[PDB]
Amino acid sequence: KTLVVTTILSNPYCMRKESAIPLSGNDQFEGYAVDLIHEISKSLGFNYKIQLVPDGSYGSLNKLTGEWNGMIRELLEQRADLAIADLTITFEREQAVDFTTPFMNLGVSILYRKGTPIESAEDLAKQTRIKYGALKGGSTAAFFRDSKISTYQRMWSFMESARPSVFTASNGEGVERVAKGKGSYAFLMESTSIEYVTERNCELTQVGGMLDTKSYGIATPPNSPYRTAINSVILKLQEEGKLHILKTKWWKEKRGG
Amino acid sequence: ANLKNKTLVVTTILSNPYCMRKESAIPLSGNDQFEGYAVDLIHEISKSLGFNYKIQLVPDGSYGSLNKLTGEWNGMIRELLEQRADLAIADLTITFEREQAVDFTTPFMNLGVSILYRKGTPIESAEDLAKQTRIKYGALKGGSTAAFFRDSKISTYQRMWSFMESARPSVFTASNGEGVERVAKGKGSYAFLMESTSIEYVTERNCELTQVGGMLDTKSYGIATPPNSPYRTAINSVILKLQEEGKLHILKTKWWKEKRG
Ligand SMILES: CN[C@H](CC(=O)O)C(=O)O
Ligand SMILES: CN[C@H](CC(=O)O)C(=O)O
């Protein structure tokens, strides 16, 4: 059979491949997610077409309209069979689509300069000289805004009250603000992104662990007949080392893409 | 389906710091005799969903392995299949093999194999170990780490597996604690491959040991249920909410860094 796969550009999950000759179809794209679906399709014997989500969104719920956008909407409107991207499995998305077994685990962590005694979020919340922020309007900021845990409330109050603003318009802007800050600024974001950055900037490091836990998985329309088949392939690819090879390839070897 | 006012049997196994006997001047009874990460976790889940439960240690002291000759399971896996427990909460690895017999919830913890070694050597990775022969390296006999090496098709790990199987005297151990001691007393002559979470627990408590490199694979612990259990999806939602709020990370910090037994 032939499936439509929706995805979104995000380094190094799905990137446009550089080429002197113009590329078409699936060859336009490369990255971890591109390789992952290639391997899944080999096991299960389907063909597929990768299509970027036309609206450029992951999928959020309009809470007063009930409508989804992004890759989620493509699934629910029968324009994609699978969504394969750095798409976070959340209780909310699980109420509208199904998710496979995760292919990657991650969590909020801290990007900072190497070689200081700052070892944890707790070390940042106990001090006031170092400023710290996050992407404006993103899920990292929401983790802090929404928390009822005293530690993270104190941090959110500090972040919201800092001037100039500690929130950035992009993750890259936060990375650069750390890199040029001489320790005056730390940036909270996904641990997988931090690893991507620290593989490419020897002066930076992750600080502490993962303050939350979450995963990326493939999304399907509810009751898709392909979900359990993909779950088994994902576990098999994992247990033989194929996903480990793909992670190293894209985070450590392809210094870009 | 509904869990309010129900009483569940929960099987577990002693394993630090998931489930440990609590110290007390007076003997403790029932659930109060145990403490640890898994004990706190099931308490939280029970409060959210409104059920009661009794913790019972698995009688045969085993996690659950499949005898391929006979088809028989043992351990906590068997207790679920024989309907003598409703849930198994422990450091029980979600594997494809176990998934063909029982169900698992959403994972509560993610981990992977890594290296326990002495602090401050030139060894930086598994690749460094694999390309040399002077430093010996091993794992727990018959466990998930050994199965990972046995099942890897990656050249590095397949090479390591061949080396470990060939080494005389045996590099395998009967417990993780024996492996830890072999690293400590080995002064660099021995490295031990085991779960990253166990390496973290050890290195928090022995300052001369360290983790070398990252994870060589990925695997998770989840709550196991009888197949087709009507409670799995309700528990999944509770776990996802604890994960998204950071409460499992806080629980891990408590049992790994704050408490000592
Ligand atoms: C890279 N993941 C995006 C952004 C986020 O979760 O904050 C998403 O799944 O919506
Ligand atoms: C602590 N996990 C046990 C033992 C092992 O993985 O070797 C298991 O899942 O069987």
Side-chain angles (χ1 to χ4, degrees), chain B residues 79-120:
Chain B
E79 291 297 291
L80 296 170
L81 298 177
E82 299 278 333
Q83 292 193 145
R84 271 189 304 274
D86 299 287
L87 307 170
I89 189 173
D91 54 339
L92 180 67
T93 309
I94 304 174
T95 66
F96 180 87
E97 188 181 53
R98 287 167 173 162
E99 282 278 17
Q100 310 316 298
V102 300
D103 294 343
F104 289 90
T105 65
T106 309
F108 57 81
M109 191 174 291
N110 303 315
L111 59 140
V113 170
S114 191
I115 299 165
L116 180 70
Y117 196 45
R118 294 305 306 254
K119 206 170 267 184

Tab-separated table of all heavy atoms in Angstrom, chain B residues 79-120:
chain	number	residue	atom	x	y	z
B	79	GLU	N	3.302	-14.310	38.112
B	79	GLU	CA	2.250	-13.935	39.056
B	79	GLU	C	1.103	-13.201	38.365
B	79	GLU	O	-0.060	-13.347	38.772
B	79	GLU	CB	2.806	-13.073	40.190
B	79	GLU	CG	3.731	-13.805	41.139
B	79	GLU	CD	3.018	-14.942	41.874
B	79	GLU	OE1	2.147	-14.650	42.721
B	79	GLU	OE2	3.311	-16.125	41.586
B	80	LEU	N	1.405	-12.405	37.325
B	80	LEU	CA	0.352	-11.757	36.549
B	80	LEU	C	-0.406	-12.767	35.699
B	80	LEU	O	-1.638	-12.722	35.631
B	80	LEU	CB	0.976	-10.685	35.669
B	80	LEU	CG	1.644	-9.523	36.417
B	80	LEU	CD1	2.439	-8.660	35.482
B	80	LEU	CD2	0.613	-8.685	37.167
B	81	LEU	N	0.309	-13.706	35.064
B	81	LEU	CA	-0.337	-14.694	34.202
B	81	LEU	C	-1.205	-15.671	34.978
B	81	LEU	O	-2.185	-16.204	34.433
B	81	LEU	CB	0.714	-15.442	33.394
B	81	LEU	CG	1.530	-14.575	32.441
B	81	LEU	CD1	2.598	-15.399	31.753
B	81	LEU	CD2	0.657	-13.876	31.418
B	82	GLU	N	-0.851	-15.953	36.221
B	82	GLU	CA	-1.622	-16.869	37.050
B	82	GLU	C	-2.695	-16.146	37.852
B	82	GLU	O	-3.325	-16.756	38.726
B	82	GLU	CB	-0.689	-17.636	37.999
B	82	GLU	CG	0.362	-18.493	37.306
B	82	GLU	CD	-0.167	-19.829	36.850
B	82	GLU	OE1	-1.131	-20.326	37.471
B	82	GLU	OE2	0.378	-20.380	35.870
B	83	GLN	N	-2.881	-14.853	37.605
B	83	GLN	CA	-3.898	-14.050	38.277
B	83	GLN	C	-3.695	-13.970	39.792
B	83	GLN	O	-4.662	-13.842	40.542
B	83	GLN	CB	-5.316	-14.518	37.924
B	83	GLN	CG	-5.701	-14.252	36.473
B	83	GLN	CD	-7.203	-14.423	36.204
B	83	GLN	OE1	-7.783	-13.698	35.394
B	83	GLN	NE2	-7.830	-15.382	36.878
B	84	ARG	N	-2.440	-14.015	40.257
B	84	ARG	CA	-2.112	-13.828	41.672
B	84	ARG	C	-1.624	-12.422	41.990
B	84	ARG	O	-1.296	-12.138	43.146
B	84	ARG	CB	-1.051	-14.824	42.112
B	84	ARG	CG	-1.648	-16.125	42.599
B	84	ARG	CD	-0.591	-16.988	43.231
B	84	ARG	NE	0.501	-17.214	42.298
B	84	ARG	CZ	0.520	-18.177	41.386
B	84	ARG	NH1	-0.501	-19.019	41.277
B	84	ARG	NH2	1.563	-18.298	40.573
B	85	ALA	N	-1.516	-11.557	40.988
B	85	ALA	CA	-1.333	-10.131	41.206
B	85	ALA	C	-2.046	-9.376	40.097
B	85	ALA	O	-2.166	-9.858	38.965
B	85	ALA	CB	0.147	-9.739	41.242
B	86	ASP	N	-2.522	-8.184	40.442
B	86	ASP	CA	-3.122	-7.275	39.480
B	86	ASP	C	-2.101	-6.357	38.806
B	86	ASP	O	-2.290	-5.965	37.651
B	86	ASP	CB	-4.159	-6.415	40.199
B	86	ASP	CG	-5.276	-7.250	40.793
B	86	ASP	OD1	-6.101	-7.748	40.001
B	86	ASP	OD2	-5.284	-7.449	42.030
B	87	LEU	N	-1.038	-5.980	39.505
B	87	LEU	CA	-0.010	-5.100	38.972
B	87	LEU	C	1.332	-5.583	39.485
B	87	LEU	O	1.436	-6.043	40.624
B	87	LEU	CB	-0.173	-3.648	39.454
B	87	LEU	CG	-1.525	-2.992	39.235
B	87	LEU	CD1	-1.607	-1.678	39.979
B	87	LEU	CD2	-1.776	-2.787	37.771
B	88	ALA	N	2.373	-5.419	38.667
B	88	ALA	CA	3.751	-5.608	39.110
B	88	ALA	C	4.450	-4.266	38.970
B	88	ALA	O	4.461	-3.685	37.879
B	88	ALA	CB	4.444	-6.654	38.238
B	89	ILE	N	4.936	-3.724	40.081
B	89	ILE	CA	5.650	-2.453	40.054
B	89	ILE	C	7.027	-2.704	40.625
B	89	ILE	O	7.162	-3.144	41.773
B	89	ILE	CB	4.907	-1.304	40.764
B	89	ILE	CG1	5.637	0.020	40.488
B	89	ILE	CG2	4.752	-1.553	42.263
B	89	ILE	CD1	4.920	1.241	40.979
B	90	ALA	N	8.032	-2.495	39.801
B	90	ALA	CA	9.409	-2.801	40.129
B	90	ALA	C	10.297	-2.212	39.038
B	90	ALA	O	9.812	-1.638	38.062
B	90	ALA	CB	9.567	-4.324	40.188
B	91	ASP	N	11.600	-2.402	39.192
B	91	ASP	CA	12.541	-2.140	38.113
B	91	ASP	C	12.527	-3.261	37.075
B	91	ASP	O	13.515	-3.941	36.840
B	91	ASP	CB	13.922	-1.827	38.664
B	91	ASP	CG	14.488	-2.886	39.612
B	91	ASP	OD1	13.745	-3.709	40.206
B	91	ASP	OD2	15.725	-2.844	39.791
B	92	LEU	N	11.357	-3.421	36.446
B	92	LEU	CA	11.055	-4.502	35.514
B	92	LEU	C	11.113	-3.964	34.080
B	92	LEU	O	10.321	-3.105	33.688
B	92	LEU	CB	9.662	-5.032	35.840
B	92	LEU	CG	9.160	-6.178	34.964
B	92	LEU	CD1	9.958	-7.469	35.173
B	92	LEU	CD2	7.688	-6.433	35.234
B	93	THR	N	12.091	-4.440	33.323
B	93	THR	CA	12.372	-3.926	31.982
B	93	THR	C	11.261	-4.315	31.015
B	93	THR	O	10.856	-5.482	30.947
B	93	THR	CB	13.691	-4.502	31.446
B	93	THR	OG1	14.729	-4.315	32.420
B	93	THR	CG2	14.124	-3.825	30.149
B	94	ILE	N	10.790	-3.331	30.262
B	94	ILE	CA	9.878	-3.569	29.140
B	94	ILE	C	10.691	-4.141	27.978
B	94	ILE	O	11.551	-3.466	27.421
B	94	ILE	CB	9.141	-2.290	28.715
B	94	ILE	CG1	8.391	-1.665	29.890
B	94	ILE	CG2	8.195	-2.595	27.560
B	94	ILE	CD1	7.759	-0.311	29.558
B	95	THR	N	10.433	-5.398	27.631
B	95	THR	CA	11.117	-6.038	26.512
B	95	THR	C	10.090	-6.598	25.541
B	95	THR	O	8.951	-6.887	25.922
B	95	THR	CB	12.018	-7.172	26.978
B	95	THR	OG1	11.210	-8.218	27.530
B	95	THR	CG2	12.983	-6.702	28.035
B	96	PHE	N	10.508	-6.744	24.278
B	96	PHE	CA	9.621	-7.339	23.289
B	96	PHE	C	9.164	-8.707	23.768
B	96	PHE	O	7.977	-9.048	23.679
B	96	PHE	CB	10.334	-7.427	21.934
B	96	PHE	CG	9.488	-8.031	20.852
B	96	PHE	CD1	8.625	-7.257	20.088
B	96	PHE	CD2	9.522	-9.383	20.630
B	96	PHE	CE1	7.843	-7.828	19.099
B	96	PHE	CE2	8.739	-9.965	19.638
B	96	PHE	CZ	7.892	-9.186	18.890
B	97	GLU	N	10.088	-9.499	24.326
B	97	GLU	CA	9.723	-10.823	24.805
B	97	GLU	C	8.622	-10.757	25.868
B	97	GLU	O	7.642	-11.500	25.812
B	97	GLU	CB	10.972	-11.536	25.321
B	97	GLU	CG	10.729	-12.967	25.667
B	97	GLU	CD	11.977	-13.641	26.192
B	97	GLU	OE1	12.599	-13.103	27.141
B	97	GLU	OE2	12.345	-14.693	25.634
B	98	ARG	N	8.769	-9.885	26.864
B	98	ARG	CA	7.751	-9.786	27.919
B	98	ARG	C	6.435	-9.216	27.387
B	98	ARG	O	5.356	-9.621	27.833
B	98	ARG	CB	8.273	-8.962	29.107
B	98	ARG	CG	9.312	-9.687	29.938
B	98	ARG	CD	10.014	-8.744	30.882
B	98	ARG	NE	10.877	-9.485	31.784
B	98	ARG	CZ	11.857	-8.950	32.488
B	98	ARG	NH1	12.105	-7.662	32.415
B	98	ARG	NH2	12.597	-9.715	33.266
B	99	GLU	N	6.507	-8.326	26.406
B	99	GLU	CA	5.320	-7.738	25.798
B	99	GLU	C	4.475	-8.760	25.053
B	99	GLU	O	3.307	-8.475	24.767
B	99	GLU	CB	5.704	-6.629	24.819
B	99	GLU	CG	6.077	-5.328	25.474
B	99	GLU	CD	4.857	-4.505	25.839
B	99	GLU	OE1	3.741	-5.061	25.885
B	99	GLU	OE2	5.008	-3.283	26.060
B	100	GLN	N	5.027	-9.929	24.714
B	100	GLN	CA	4.212	-10.955	24.067
B	100	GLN	C	3.392	-11.738	25.081
B	100	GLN	O	2.541	-12.543	24.684
B	100	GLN	CB	5.052	-11.929	23.222
B	100	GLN	CG	6.037	-11.293	22.232
B	100	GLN	CD	5.454	-10.125	21.453
B	100	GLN	OE1	4.483	-10.280	20.697
B	100	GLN	NE2	6.049	-8.943	21.626
B	101	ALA	N	3.611	-11.513	26.384
B	101	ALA	CA	2.879	-12.242	27.416
B	101	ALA	C	2.035	-11.370	28.326
B	101	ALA	O	0.976	-11.809	28.772
B	101	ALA	CB	3.837	-13.068	28.290
B	102	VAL	N	2.499	-10.171	28.680
B	102	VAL	CA	1.785	-9.272	29.586
B	102	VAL	C	1.666	-7.907	28.914
B	102	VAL	O	2.286	-7.643	27.888
B	102	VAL	CB	2.458	-9.158	30.981
B	102	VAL	CG1	2.517	-10.510	31.665
B	102	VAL	CG2	3.850	-8.556	30.879
B	103	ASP	N	0.893	-7.023	29.529
B	103	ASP	CA	0.860	-5.624	29.116
B	103	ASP	C	1.730	-4.775	30.040
B	103	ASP	O	1.994	-5.135	31.183
B	103	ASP	CB	-0.563	-5.057	29.144
B	103	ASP	CG	-1.502	-5.696	28.133
B	103	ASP	OD1	-1.045	-6.357	27.177
B	103	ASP	OD2	-2.731	-5.488	28.289
B	104	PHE	N	2.228	-3.677	29.509
B	104	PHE	CA	2.901	-2.667	30.312
B	104	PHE	C	2.221	-1.315	30.143
B	104	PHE	O	1.748	-0.979	29.053
B	104	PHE	CB	4.364	-2.516	29.901
B	104	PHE	CG	5.233	-3.676	30.276
B	104	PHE	CD1	5.401	-4.739	29.420
B	104	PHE	CD2	5.911	-3.689	31.462
B	104	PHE	CE1	6.218	-5.787	29.746
B	104	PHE	CE2	6.746	-4.744	31.798
B	104	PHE	CZ	6.906	-5.785	30.931
B	105	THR	N	2.239	-0.527	31.212
B	105	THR	CA	1.828	0.857	31.161
B	105	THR	C	2.874	1.691	30.455
B	105	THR	O	3.988	1.247	30.173
B	105	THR	CB	1.684	1.430	32.582
B	105	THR	OG1	2.965	1.474	33.260
B	105	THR	CG2	0.701	0.642	33.403
B	106	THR	N	2.504	2.935	30.208
B	106	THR	CA	3.432	4.016	29.940
B	106	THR	C	4.626	3.873	30.877
B	106	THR	O	4.428	3.618	32.067
B	106	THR	CB	2.744	5.365	30.229
B	106	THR	OG1	1.474	5.429	29.558
B	106	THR	CG2	3.643	6.520	29.828
B	107	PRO	N	5.855	4.039	30.404
B	107	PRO	CA	7.001	3.897	31.302
B	107	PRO	C	7.055	4.987	32.354
B	107	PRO	O	6.766	6.155	32.082
B	107	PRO	CB	8.212	4.026	30.375
B	107	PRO	CG	7.736	3.877	29.035
B	107	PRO	CD	6.269	4.162	29.001
B	108	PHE	N	7.486	4.621	33.548
B	108	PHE	CA	7.782	5.606	34.565
B	108	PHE	C	9.245	5.993	34.613
B	108	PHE	O	9.560	7.019	35.205
B	108	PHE	CB	7.244	5.177	35.942
B	108	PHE	CG	7.742	3.855	36.430
B	108	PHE	CD1	8.982	3.765	37.025
B	108	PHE	CD2	6.968	2.705	36.340
B	108	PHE	CE1	9.455	2.568	37.477
B	108	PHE	CE2	7.424	1.511	36.800
B	108	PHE	CZ	8.671	1.430	37.373
B	109	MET	N	10.132	5.244	33.973
B	109	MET	CA	11.545	5.571	33.988
B	109	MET	C	12.177	5.072	32.706
B	109	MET	O	11.861	3.978	32.233
B	109	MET	CB	12.243	4.921	35.183
B	109	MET	CG	13.650	5.410	35.427
B	109	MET	SD	14.255	4.680	36.937
B	109	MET	CE	13.227	5.528	38.143
B	110	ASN	N	13.068	5.880	32.160
B	110	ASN	CA	13.853	5.553	30.979
B	110	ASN	C	15.320	5.452	31.370
B	110	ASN	O	15.800	6.218	32.222
B	110	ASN	CB	13.718	6.628	29.899
B	110	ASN	CG	12.301	6.857	29.492
B	110	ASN	OD1	11.540	5.917	29.273
B	110	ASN	ND2	11.922	8.126	29.389
B	111	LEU	N	16.042	4.526	30.742
B	111	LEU	CA	17.434	4.241	31.099
B	111	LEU	C	18.135	3.576	29.916
B	111	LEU	O	17.603	3.503	28.805
B	111	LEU	CB	17.515	3.393	32.374
B	111	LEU	CG	16.787	2.054	32.240
B	111	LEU	CD1	17.575	0.936	32.896
B	111	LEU	CD2	15.336	2.102	32.811
B	112	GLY	N	19.353	3.107	30.147
B	112	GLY	CA	20.088	2.384	29.129
B	112	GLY	C	21.339	1.800	29.749
B	112	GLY	O	21.750	2.194	30.838
B	113	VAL	N	21.963	0.877	29.031
B	113	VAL	CA	23.222	0.300	29.485
B	113	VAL	C	24.315	1.357	29.424
B	113	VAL	O	24.436	2.093	28.441
B	113	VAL	CB	23.581	-0.902	28.602
B	113	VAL	CG1	25.011	-1.398	28.887
B	113	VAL	CG2	22.541	-2.020	28.751
B	114	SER	N	25.174	1.389	30.441
B	114	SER	CA	26.361	2.223	30.401
B	114	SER	C	27.492	1.493	31.119
B	114	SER	O	27.367	0.323	31.480
B	114	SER	CB	26.054	3.630	30.928
B	114	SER	OG	27.124	4.504	30.658
B	115	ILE	N	28.602	2.202	31.325
B	115	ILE	CA	29.835	1.630	31.869
B	115	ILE	C	30.102	2.197	33.257
B	115	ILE	O	30.092	3.421	33.436
B	115	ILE	CB	31.023	1.937	30.942
B	115	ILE	CG1	30.810	1.333	29.555
B	115	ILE	CG2	32.341	1.433	31.564
B	115	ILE	CD1	31.754	1.894	28.485
B	116	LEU	N	30.361	1.307	34.223
B	116	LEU	CA	30.861	1.662	35.545
B	116	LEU	C	32.362	1.386	35.561
B	116	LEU	O	32.793	0.273	35.248
B	116	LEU	CB	30.177	0.827	36.625
B	116	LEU	CG	30.633	1.138	38.052
B	116	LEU	CD1	30.152	2.501	38.511
B	116	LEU	CD2	30.161	0.075	39.012
B	117	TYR	N	33.160	2.399	35.896
B	117	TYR	CA	34.603	2.233	35.898
B	117	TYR	C	35.200	3.119	36.977
B	117	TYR	O	34.500	3.855	37.686
B	117	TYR	CB	35.148	2.566	34.507
B	117	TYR	CG	36.556	2.103	34.177
B	117	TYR	CD1	36.989	0.824	34.485
B	117	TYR	CD2	37.436	2.935	33.474
B	117	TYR	CE1	38.279	0.401	34.145
B	117	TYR	CE2	38.704	2.515	33.133
B	117	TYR	CZ	39.124	1.244	33.462
B	117	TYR	OH	40.408	0.851	33.114
B	118	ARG	N	36.523	3.042	37.087
B	118	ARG	CA	37.272	3.924	37.960
B	118	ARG	C	37.311	5.330	37.378
B	118	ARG	O	37.276	5.527	36.157
B	118	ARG	CB	38.697	3.392	38.118
B	118	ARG	CG	38.777	2.062	38.853
B	118	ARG	CD	38.093	2.147	40.209
B	118	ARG	NE	38.620	3.260	40.995
B	118	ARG	CZ	39.435	3.138	42.037
B	118	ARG	NH1	39.820	1.942	42.462
B	118	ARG	NH2	39.859	4.224	42.668
B	119	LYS	N	37.384	6.315	38.267
B	119	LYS	CA	37.408	7.700	37.831
B	119	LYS	C	38.795	8.074	37.324
B	119	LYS	O	39.811	7.615	37.853
B	119	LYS	CB	37.017	8.594	39.009
B	119	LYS	CG	36.406	9.915	38.623
B	119	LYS	CD	35.818	10.629	39.838
B	119	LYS	CE	34.342	10.316	40.035
B	119	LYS	NZ	33.751	11.103	41.169
B	120	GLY	N	38.828	8.877	36.262
B	120	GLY	CA	40.054	9.488	35.787
B	120	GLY	C	41.001	8.612	34.987
B	120	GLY	O	42.195	8.563	35.298
